[PDB]
Design an enzyme around this catalytic site. Structure first.
Site, PDB file in Angstrom:
ATOM      1  N   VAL A  28       0.799  -1.238   0.000  1.00  0.00           N
ATOM      2  CA  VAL A  28       0.000   0.000   0.000  1.00  0.00           C
ATOM      3  C   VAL A  28       0.837   1.297   0.000  1.00  0.00           C
ATOM      4  O   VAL A  28       0.281   2.400  -0.163  1.00  0.00           O
ATOM      5  CB  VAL A  28      -0.975   0.030   1.207  1.00  0.00           C
ATOM      6  CG1 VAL A  28      -1.973  -1.101   1.096  1.00  0.00           C
ATOM      7  CG2 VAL A  28      -0.211  -0.046   2.548  1.00  0.00           C
ATOM      8  N   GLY A  29       2.155   1.165   0.179  1.00  0.00           N
ATOM      9  CA  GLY A  29       3.066   2.316   0.242  1.00  0.00           C
ATOM     10  C   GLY A  29       4.495   1.965  -0.137  1.00  0.00           C
ATOM     11  O   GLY A  29       4.935   0.836   0.056  1.00  0.00           O
ATOM     12  N   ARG A  30       5.208   2.949  -0.680  1.00  0.00           N
ATOM     13  CA  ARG A  30       6.608   2.807  -1.094  1.00  0.00           C
ATOM     14  C   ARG A  30       7.241   4.203  -1.091  1.00  0.00           C
ATOM     15  O   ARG A  30       6.703   5.129  -1.696  1.00  0.00           O
ATOM     16  CB  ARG A  30       6.685   2.178  -2.492  1.00  0.00           C
ATOM     17  CG  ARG A  30       8.096   1.960  -3.058  1.00  0.00           C
ATOM     18  CD  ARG A  30       8.786   0.765  -2.430  1.00  0.00           C
ATOM     19  NE  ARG A  30      10.169   0.623  -2.897  1.00  0.00           N
ATOM     20  CZ  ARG A  30      11.216   1.344  -2.479  1.00  0.00           C
ATOM     21  NH1 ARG A  30      11.086   2.304  -1.561  1.00  0.00           N
ATOM     22  NH2 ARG A  30      12.420   1.105  -2.995  1.00  0.00           N
ATOM     23  N   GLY A  31       8.363   4.351  -0.388  1.00  0.00           N
ATOM     24  CA  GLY A  31       9.066   5.637  -0.291  1.00  0.00           C
ATOM     25  C   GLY A  31      10.475   5.481   0.256  1.00  0.00           C
ATOM     26  O   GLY A  31      11.078   4.411   0.140  1.00  0.00           O
ATOM     27  N   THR A  32      11.003   6.545   0.855  1.00  0.00           N
ATOM     28  CA  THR A  32      12.356   6.517   1.417  1.00  0.00           C
ATOM     29  C   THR A  32      12.423   5.632   2.666  1.00  0.00           C
ATOM     30  O   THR A  32      13.438   4.985   2.908  1.00  0.00           O
ATOM     31  CB  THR A  32      12.873   7.934   1.736  1.00  0.00           C
ATOM     32  OG1 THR A  32      11.988   8.580   2.661  1.00  0.00           O
ATOM     33  CG2 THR A  32      12.974   8.759   0.459  1.00  0.00           C
ATOM     34  N   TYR A  33      11.338   5.608   3.440  1.00  0.00           N
ATOM     35  CA  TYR A  33      11.184   4.702   4.604  1.00  0.00           C
ATOM     36  C   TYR A  33      11.284   3.193   4.296  1.00  0.00           C
ATOM     37  O   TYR A  33      11.671   2.402   5.165  1.00  0.00           O
ATOM     38  CB  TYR A  33       9.849   4.970   5.320  1.00  0.00           C
ATOM     39  CG  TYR A  33       8.611   4.831   4.446  1.00  0.00           C
ATOM     40  CD1 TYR A  33       8.070   3.573   4.139  1.00  0.00           C
ATOM     41  CD2 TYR A  33       7.969   5.960   3.937  1.00  0.00           C
ATOM     42  CE1 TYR A  33       6.940   3.449   3.337  1.00  0.00           C
ATOM     43  CE2 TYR A  33       6.839   5.849   3.137  1.00  0.00           C
ATOM     44  CZ  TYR A  33       6.326   4.588   2.834  1.00  0.00           C
ATOM     45  OH  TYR A  33       5.203   4.477   2.039  1.00  0.00           O
ATOM     46  N   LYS A  53       5.900  -2.807   7.602  1.00  0.00           N
ATOM     47  CA  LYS A  53       6.927  -1.977   6.985  1.00  0.00           C
ATOM     48  C   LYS A  53       8.238  -2.754   6.943  1.00  0.00           C
ATOM     49  O   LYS A  53       8.751  -3.126   8.000  1.00  0.00           O
ATOM     50  CB  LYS A  53       7.111  -0.706   7.828  1.00  0.00           C
ATOM     51  CG  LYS A  53       8.272   0.200   7.406  1.00  0.00           C
ATOM     52  CD  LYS A  53       8.139   1.566   8.061  1.00  0.00           C
ATOM     53  CE  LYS A  53       9.487   2.203   8.368  1.00  0.00           C
ATOM     54  NZ  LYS A  53       9.325   3.396   9.240  1.00  0.00           N
ATOM     55  N   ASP A 148       8.826  16.519  11.346  1.00  0.00           N
ATOM     56  CA  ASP A 148       8.374  16.409   9.945  1.00  0.00           C
ATOM     57  C   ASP A 148       6.861  16.187   9.852  1.00  0.00           C
ATOM     58  O   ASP A 148       6.401  15.325   9.105  1.00  0.00           O
ATOM     59  CB  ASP A 148       9.144  15.281   9.218  1.00  0.00           C
ATOM     60  CG  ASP A 148       8.952  15.301   7.690  1.00  0.00           C
ATOM     61  OD1 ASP A 148       8.522  16.337   7.126  1.00  0.00           O
ATOM     62  OD2 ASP A 148       9.234  14.262   7.051  1.00  0.00           O
TER      63      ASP A 148
HETATM   64  C1  LIG Z   1       0.128   5.917   0.595  1.00  0.00           C
HETATM   65  N1  LIG Z   1       0.398   6.364   1.961  1.00  0.00           N
HETATM   66  C2  LIG Z   1       0.286   5.603   3.131  1.00  0.00           C
HETATM   67  C3  LIG Z   1       0.131   4.196   3.180  1.00  0.00           C
HETATM   68  C4  LIG Z   1       0.047   3.528   4.382  1.00  0.00           C
HETATM   69  C5  LIG Z   1       0.111   4.243   5.584  1.00  0.00           C
HETATM   70  C6  LIG Z   1       0.044   3.566   6.896  1.00  0.00           C
HETATM   71  C7  LIG Z   1      -1.115   2.879   7.242  1.00  0.00           C
HETATM   72  N2  LIG Z   1      -1.211   2.266   8.407  1.00  0.00           N
HETATM   73  C8  LIG Z   1      -0.217   2.280   9.283  1.00  0.00           C
HETATM   74  C9  LIG Z   1       0.977   2.936   9.034  1.00  0.00           C
HETATM   75 CL1  LIG Z   1       2.212   2.883  10.255  1.00  0.00          CL
HETATM   76  C10 LIG Z   1       1.139   3.606   7.808  1.00  0.00           C
HETATM   77  N3  LIG Z   1       2.316   4.300   7.493  1.00  0.00           N
HETATM   78  C11 LIG Z   1       2.723   5.495   8.253  1.00  0.00           C
HETATM   79  C12 LIG Z   1       4.214   5.457   8.609  1.00  0.00           C
HETATM   80  C13 LIG Z   1       5.092   5.139   7.402  1.00  0.00           C
HETATM   81  C14 LIG Z   1       4.627   3.874   6.690  1.00  0.00           C
HETATM   82  C15 LIG Z   1       3.139   3.913   6.335  1.00  0.00           C
HETATM   83  C16 LIG Z   1       5.183   6.340   6.439  1.00  0.00           C
HETATM   84  N4  LIG Z   1       6.558   6.811   6.661  1.00  0.00           N
HETATM   85  C17 LIG Z   1       7.201   5.941   7.460  1.00  0.00           C
HETATM   86  O1  LIG Z   1       8.351   6.066   7.823  1.00  0.00           O
HETATM   87  O2  LIG Z   1       6.455   4.909   7.835  1.00  0.00           O
HETATM   88  C18 LIG Z   1       0.272   5.621   5.541  1.00  0.00           C
HETATM   89  C19 LIG Z   1       0.356   6.288   4.334  1.00  0.00           C
HETATM   90  C20 LIG Z   1       0.530   7.782   4.165  1.00  0.00           C
HETATM   91  S1  LIG Z   1       0.950   7.866   2.404  1.00  0.00           S
HETATM   92  O3  LIG Z   1       0.146   8.817   1.731  1.00  0.00           O
HETATM   93  O4  LIG Z   1       2.355   7.797   2.234  1.00  0.00           O
END
Ligand SMILES: CN1c2ccc(-c3cncc(Cl)c3N3CCC4(CC3)CNC(=O)O4)cc2CS1(=O)=O
Lengths: 344, 266
Positions: A28-33, A53, A148
């Site tokens: 559901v997510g992909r970035g620098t983290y 994560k 941030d």
């Molecule tokens: C698409 N996006 C998504 C996806 C999932 C989530 C999400 C859903 N539930 C729980 C968590 Cl902990 C989630 N995180 C927040 C913390 C993170 C990982 C993703 C982002 N940076 C990082 O260092 O760790 C958030 C967000 C915002 S977003 O717009 O970037």
């Protein structure tokens, strides 16, 4: 020299992430983290969704180390909870398990802003603001700065036991020497843009002021066009919105390392017909409302004159009808979509 | 500064203040090879190794203390045979350095520090040079973090001691001596068995007794269980008699050979 029985015993008992959770295709997510997945528990004890994560890189970097250290201690309803850590020895990857948050303020604000042409529950904004302030206050009481804050990081729980509770996330855990000197700048305090050497509680509180104004208008208050801390065009927008700060409004501005650059680039008289009163009046927020007055205390230019989170929670805005609710949606049907999945 | 007031809800307090009888039960594994006496001499020895590593790397005392506590927590749960303590000591410094935010210890600088400290300061105990490369540190790091259940924030007696001597208004006279006694308490199990402020209080009391400072009513004016503070004083007073009767340099080669050895893979 590592005992073999000790080794294979631990290797037998080790909880591995790929055995415990189904997350294949659920990114559901992909970035620098790193890479976040919507995970479900394979041994069906519960039917809850979790956020998985995989941390960027290998090993334990300073960022990883401090994120684990602090989240392992932190415990508040409005701060995201680390459920467990998996250390994969073969590939040296670190996984963190969290509660799953369906929505965030970036996606919520974008849904309203998108539908406005082509904040429906009363008291939603206020509830979001109070819970953002409650979370940040807990961190600040434990001397943990966020560093941030922005709408993408302010998460909101979907359907389930924690329906509509704000969850702060993505704290800036690793910054060398607590320094910003070691791309979008819309939520950054003017002292950071003027070369402030260290992060502060006030820098976080400013961010909270920007988010709040975004919740009320659906536009980022200090929106701007896309290394060193000084950013001219970002400062131009702050002044168009806030006015240029008078000497009496921020005495110590002369002590900032980029003060002489500001004087060279900017003239007070450019922003004579500019104030937060006037900006918010154009976006249909009343300047005599308690909502506006609280915002002005949060969006104060001088950092030493910005209110703290503990004073913001105490504001009479939270004693005026409607009262803040634990469920930000107030028991109402949630009209936002779920998170789209992704590829690799 | 981070988490300064959260001790009563911290992972330190809720998981890592151990029962004394549980600690000694797990210790019986190594007492088949070593005597109780030899076991604490080993504990004293490796507290000094970690201290020497810290000084060489120019780390502040609190970082060195977190390192020492990581080492103590590991061998409180596991045998000395499980991972070589010569590998564990620099791994504990490495990880502890990474928890604090001001600066990072590099790979080459960690290995060079371990090599140099053991050759120049501990050649009585070690004839052969430090044999582990950095990839042995990185592997050991994963086991350490995992055994500690990812508990990295450690509270120490230094912060409360400073607040107590400031409260007495005798910072100049007592603080150097009392701070040095807190350092010395890391030669014992005290940090696994008592909250930091009580250790701080015991160390201040001993500092007052040594300097003939009359702090009777100041100590009475505290609200705390004194019997437990007395228990710590006795451990500190016994540590100095241990210190007197122990020649680390003459004894530690023999004691390190009695340590149970890690079994290799057949
Ligand atoms: C698409 N996006 C998504 C996806 C999932 C989530 C999400 C859903 N539930 C729980 C968590 Cl902990 C989630 N995180 C927040 C913390 C993170 C990982 C993703 C982002 N940076 C990082 O260092 O760790 C958030 C967000 C915002 S977003 O717009 O970037």
């Amino acid at each position: 020299k590592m005992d073999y029985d000790f080794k294979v015993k631990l290797s037998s008992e080790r909880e591995r992430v790929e055995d415990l959770f189904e997350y294949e295709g659920c990114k559901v997510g992909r970035g620098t983290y790193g890479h976040v997945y919507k995970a479900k528990r394979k041994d069906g004890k519960d039917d809850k969704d979790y956020a998985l994560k995989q941390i960027e890189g290998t090993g334990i970097s300073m960022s990883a180390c401090r994120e684990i250290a602090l989240l392992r201690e932190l415990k508040h309803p409005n701060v995201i909870s680390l459920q467990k850590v998996f250390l994969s020895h073969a590939d040296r990857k670190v996984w963190l398990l969290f509660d799953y948050a369906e929505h965030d303020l970036w996606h919520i604000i974008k849904f309203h802003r998108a539908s406005k042409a082509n904040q429906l529950p009363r008291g939603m904004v206020k509830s979001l603001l109070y819970q953002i302030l409650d979370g940040i206050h807990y961190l600040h009481a434990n001397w943990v700065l966020h560093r941030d804050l922005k709408p993408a990081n302010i998460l909101v729980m979907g359907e389930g036991p924690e329906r509509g509770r704000v969850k702060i996330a993505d704290m800036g855990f690793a910054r060398l020497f607590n320094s910003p000197l070691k791309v979008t700048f819309w939520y950054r305090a003017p002292e950071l843009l003027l070369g402030a050497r260290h992060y502060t509680k006030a820098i976080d509180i400013w961010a909270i002021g920007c988010i709040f104004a975004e919740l009320l208008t659906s536009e980022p208050i200090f929106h701007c066009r896309q290394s060193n801390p000084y950013h001219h065009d970002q400062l131009d927008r702050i002044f168009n919105v806030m006015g240029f700060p008078a000497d009496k409004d921020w005495e110590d501005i002369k002590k900032m390392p980029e003060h002489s650059t500001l004087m060279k680039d900017f003239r007070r008289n450019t922003y004579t017909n500019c104030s937060l009163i006037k900006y918010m009046e154009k976006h249909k927020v009343k300047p005599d409302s308690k909502a506006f007055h609280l915002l002005q205390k949060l969006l104060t230019m001088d950092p030493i004159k910005r209110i703290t989170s503990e004073q913001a929670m105490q504001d009479p805005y939270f004693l005026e009808d409607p009262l803040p609710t634990s469920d930000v949606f107030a028991g109402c049907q949630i009209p936002y979509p779920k998170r789209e999945f992704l590829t690799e | 500064k981070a988490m300064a007031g959260n001790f009563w809800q911290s992972s330190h307090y809720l998981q890592w203040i151990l029962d004394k009888q549980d600690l000694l039960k797990e210790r019986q594994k190594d007492l088949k090879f070593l005597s109780e006496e030899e076991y604490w001499k080993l504990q004293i020895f490796f507290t000094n190794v970690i201290q020497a590593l810290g000084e060489h790397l120019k780390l502040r005392q609190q970082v060195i203390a977190t390192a020492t506590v990581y080492f103590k927590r590991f061998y409180a749960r596991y045998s000395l045979k499980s991972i070589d303590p010569v590998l564990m000591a620099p791994t504990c410094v490495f990880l502890a350095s990474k928890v604090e935010e001001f600066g990072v210890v590099s790979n080459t600088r960690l290995i060079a520090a371990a090599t140099s400290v053991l050759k120049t300061r501990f050649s009585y105990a070690f004839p052969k040079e430090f044999p582990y490369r950095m990839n042995h540190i990185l592997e050991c790091e994963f086991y350490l973090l995992e055994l500690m259940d990812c508990c990295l924030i450690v509270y120490h007696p230094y912060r409360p001691l400073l607040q107590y001597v400031q409260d007495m208004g005798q910072e100049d006279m007592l603080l150097p001596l009392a701070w040095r006694i807190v350092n010395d308490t890391y030669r014992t199990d005290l940090c696994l068995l008592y909250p930091p402020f009580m250790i701080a209080l015991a160390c201040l009391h001993v500092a007052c007794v040594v300097q003939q400072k009359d702090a009777r009513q100041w100590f009475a004016e505290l609200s705390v269980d004194m019997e437990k503070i007395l228990e710590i004083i006795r451990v500190i007073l016994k540590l100095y008699e241990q210190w007197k009767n122990f020649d680390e340099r003459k004894e530690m080669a023999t004691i390190l050979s009695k340590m149970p050895k890690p079994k290799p893979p057949p």
